[PDB]
Amino acid sequence: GSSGSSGIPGSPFTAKITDDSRRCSQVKLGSAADFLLDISETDLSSLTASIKAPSGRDEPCLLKRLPNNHIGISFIPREVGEHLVSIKKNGNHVANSPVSIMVVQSEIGDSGPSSG
Numbered sequence: 667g668s669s670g671s672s673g674i675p676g677s678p679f680t681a682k683i684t685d686d687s688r689r690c691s692q693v694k695l696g697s698a699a700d701f702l703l704d705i706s707e708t709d710l711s712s713l714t715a716s717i718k719a720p721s722g723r724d725e726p727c728l729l730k731r732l733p734n735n736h737i738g739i740s741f742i743p744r745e746v747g748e749h750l751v752s753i754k755k756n757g758n759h760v761a762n763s764p765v766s767i768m769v770v771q772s773e774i775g776d777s778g779p780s781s782g
Contacts, residue, residue, distance in 0.1 A: 684773060691768040696742055696777065698728075699766055702738045703751075710737065716752035718746040727751065735778055741770040 667675025685692055693699045705714060715729040717739075727741030743749060746769045753763035776782075 689708055693769050695746060695771050698740050698742045700740045701740050703765055705762055712755050714754045715739055717741050719749060720747040721745050746770050
């Protein structure tokens with residue numbers, strides 16, 4: 667979208683969406699995105715946060731406490747595909763771990779509008 671004088675990005679009249687409602691999740695590559703997962707584990711610190719792209723590229727992940735009695739992880743995915751999140755407790759893998767997440771490029775562009 668277009669931002670400037672403290673103005674939130676909206677949308678024009680005609681539909682120009684660039685992402686189908688496929689049976690997959692969509693995330694913003696190169697930007698810390700939160701993930702809502704149903705886990706029977708409250709303790710945050712007691713848990714561990716680790717991620718490794720499909721190409722073997724480590725990514726900065728950070729676990730935080732979400733509102734409405736929810737909890738999710740927040741990391742900056744660099745590669746798109748099937749990411750595996752290693753979630754354990756004091757060195758003991760937890761349920762639903764490693765957590766699988768699907769990463770896809772929102773818009774076709776290498777770090778925004780910039781020459782090659």
